[PDB]
Design a protein around this ligand. Structure first.
Ligand SMILES: COCc1nc2cnc3cc(-c4c(C)noc4C)c(OC[C@H]4CCNC4)cc3c2n1[C@H](C)c1ccccc1
Ligand SMILES: N[C@@H](CCC(=O)O)C(=O)O
Length: 125
């Protein structure tokens, strides 16, 4: 009936680094997806209270969104680039679990995922 607290976006107890791959994930990958026509349902956690989706957090136990990913990159939350790529993959997979194949929101997610896969295939050394 209530929303869960959003995912953690900062942890001072975890070591921090800047890498070319982490910089690419913020400046190219997230930037590209964030400005997309279909980004907006994915820019913040699913508000299941406001959207009247009482079953959402009854089946989605690893929620993820691009608002969370943006803050995690900004706060140096990720040590390895694959940690960030996994969060994008979790966000897409969650959409493909809760929603029937061919649904409006699934088609929007698929359009974003096509662009995501192109950019990850060009991830720098
Ligand atoms: C008219 O209301 C406007 C509106 N704002 C938002 C914000 N976030 C939404 C997130 C989702 C969503 C995602 C992603 N992954 O799982 C879910 C569930 C969303 O899904 C709609 C499906 C659930 C049941 N059938 C469609 C909608 C969000 C949303 N919306 C509306 C409800 C909306 C509906 C369809 C497509 C885009 C936006
Ligand atoms: N290409 C980066 C990262 C390598 C890696 O992920 O192992 C350096 O070199």
């Amino acid at each position: 009936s209530m929303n869960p607290p959003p995912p953690e976006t900062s942890n001072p107890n975890k070591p921090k680094r800047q890498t070319n791959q982490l910089q690419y994930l913020l400046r190219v990958v997230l930037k590209t997806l964030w400005k997309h026509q279909f980004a907006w349902p994915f820019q913040q956690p699913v508000d299941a209270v406001k959207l009247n989706l009482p079953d959402y957090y009854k089946i989605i136990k690893t929620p993820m969104d691009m608002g969370t990913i943006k803050k995690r990159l900004e706060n140096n939350y990720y040590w390895n680039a694959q940690e960030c790529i996994q969060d994008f993959n979790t966000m897409f997979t969650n959409c493909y679990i809760y929603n029937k194949p061919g649904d409006d929101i699934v088609l929007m997610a698929e359009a974003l995922e096509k662009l995501f896969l192109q950019k990850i295939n060009e991830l720098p050394t």
